Amino acid sequence: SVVVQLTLAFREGTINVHDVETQFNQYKTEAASRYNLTISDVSVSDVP
C-alpha cells in the first residue's frame, strides 16, 4: 500500500484532533466512490 503523511493547518479555535479524525473517517466512503482511493488506518496527532 501507499502510506501518506501530511500536516493540516487550521486557525486557532477551529477544531480538535478528534473532530479531524472523525471527519476524515466519515469521508472514506466518498474517497472511494469519488476519488477511487481506498483509505485505511487513519492516525491523527496534535502537533505542539
Binding site: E12, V42, V44
Partner: protein, 57 residues
Amino acid sequence: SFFFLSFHISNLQFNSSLEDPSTDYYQELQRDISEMFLQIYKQGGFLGLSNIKFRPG
C-alpha cells in the same frame, strides 16, 4: 492549530516513481490528494495542508 495525519491508500501499489517527488506520478498523486483534503475540510478556519510524504506500506 496543526494536526499530523497518516493513512494508507490500500488500493495503490507503492512503486519507484513514488520514491521520487520529482516524478509526474508522485506529483499527480500529491496534487489529487491535496485537492481531496480541500473538499473534506470546509471550515472557515481550515487553511490547507503541507506537502505530502509517501512511504511504502
